[PDB]
Structure 1
Amino acid sequence: SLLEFGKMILEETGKLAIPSYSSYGCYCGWGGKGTPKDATDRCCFVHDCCYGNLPDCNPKSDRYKYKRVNGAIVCEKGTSCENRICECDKAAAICFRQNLNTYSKKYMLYPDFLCKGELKC
Structure 2
Amino acid sequence: SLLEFGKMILEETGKLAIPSYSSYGCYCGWGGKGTPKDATDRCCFVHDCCYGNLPDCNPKSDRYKYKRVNGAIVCEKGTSCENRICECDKAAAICFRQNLNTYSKKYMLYPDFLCKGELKC
TM bucket, shorter chain = over 0.9
Question: What CA deviation, in whole Å up to 9, does each residue of 1:34-66 have, x standing for no partner?
Answer: 110000000000000000000120111111111
**1:44 & 1:32 partners in 2: Cα distance?**
10
Fraction of identical pairs, as percent:
100
**1:17 & 1:34 partners in 2: Cα distance?**
22
Unaligned runs of 5+ in 2: none
Q: Which aligned segments of 4 or more residues in structure 1 are displaced greater than 4 angstroms?
A: none
**1:49 & 1:18 partners in 2: Cα distance?**
21
The count of residues paired between Structure 1 and Structure 2 equals 121
Find the residue that maps to 1:4 and give its secondary structure: helix
**2:103 & 2:97 partners in 1: Cα distance?**
10
**1:51 & 1:116 partners in 2: Cα distance?**
21
Equivalent pair of 2:31/2:48 in contact (CA under 8 Å): no
**1:30 & 1:62 partners in 2: Cα distance?**
18
Q: Deviation at 1:32?
A: 1.5
**2:64 & 2:91 partners in 1: Cα distance?**
15
Unaligned runs of 5+ in 1: none
Find the residue that maps to 1:60 and give its secondary structure: coil
With normalisation by structure 2, the TM-score equals 0.97
**1:71 & 1:34 partners in 2: Cα distance?**
34
> Which shows bigger deviation, 42-51 or 31-40?
31-40
Cα RMSD over matched residues?
0.7
Q: Deviation at 1:5?
A: 0.2
